[PDB]
Amino acid sequence: VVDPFSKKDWYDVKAPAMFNIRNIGKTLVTRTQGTKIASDGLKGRVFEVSLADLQNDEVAFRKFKLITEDVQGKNCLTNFHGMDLTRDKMCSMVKKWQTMIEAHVDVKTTDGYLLRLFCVGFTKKRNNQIRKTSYAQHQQVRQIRKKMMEIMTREVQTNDLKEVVNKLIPDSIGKDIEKACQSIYPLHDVFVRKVKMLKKPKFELGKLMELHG
Partner 1 sequence: GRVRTKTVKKAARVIIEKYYTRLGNDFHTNKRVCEEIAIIPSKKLRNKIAGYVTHLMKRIQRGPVRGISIKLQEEERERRDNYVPEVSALDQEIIEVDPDTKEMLKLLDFGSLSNLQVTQPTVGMNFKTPRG
Partner 2 sequence: LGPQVAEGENVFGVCHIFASFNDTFVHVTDLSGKETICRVTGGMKVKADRDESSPYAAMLAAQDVAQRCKELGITALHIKLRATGGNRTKTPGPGAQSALRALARSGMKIGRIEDVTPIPSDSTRRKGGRRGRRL
Partner 3 sequence: TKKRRNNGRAKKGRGHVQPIRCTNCARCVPKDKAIKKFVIRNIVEAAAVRDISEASVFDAYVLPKLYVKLHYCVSCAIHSKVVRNRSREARKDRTPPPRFR
Partner RNA sequence: GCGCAAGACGGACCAGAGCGAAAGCAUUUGCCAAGAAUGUUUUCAUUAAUCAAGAACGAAAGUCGGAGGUUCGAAGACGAUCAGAUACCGUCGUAGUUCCGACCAUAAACGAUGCCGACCGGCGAUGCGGCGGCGUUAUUCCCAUGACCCGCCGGGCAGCUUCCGGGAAACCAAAGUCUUUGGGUUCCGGGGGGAGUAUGGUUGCAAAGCUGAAACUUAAAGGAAUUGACGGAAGGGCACCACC
Which residue type does 11 have? Y
- φ, ψ at 29 (rounded to 5°): -155, 150
Q: Does 21 bind partner 2 (CB under 8 A)?
A: no
Q: Does 47 bind partner 2 (CB under 8 A)?
A: yes
- Scanning 11-61, the segments in alpha helix (DSSP H) are 38-41
Nearer residue to partner 1 within complex by CB, 96 or 202 = 96
Site string for partner 2, 51-90 (x = CB under 8 A): -----------------------------------xxx--
**d(Cα 133, Cα 96) in Å, to the nearest integer?**
9
Report in angstroms how near the CB of residue 176 gets to RNA at its nearest: 12
Q: Does 29 bind partner 2 (CB under 8 A)?
A: yes
Number of Cβ within a 10 Å radius of residue 20:
11
Q: Are 109 and 161 in contact (CB under 8 A)?
A: yes
Binding test (CB under 8 A) with partner 3, winner from 21, 60, 100, 198 = 60
| 25 interface partner picked from RNA, partner 2, partner 3, none, CB below 5 to 8 A per type | partner 2
**d(Cα 199, Cα 213) in Å, to the nearest integer?**
25
Q: Does 202 bind RNA (CB under 7 A)?
A: no
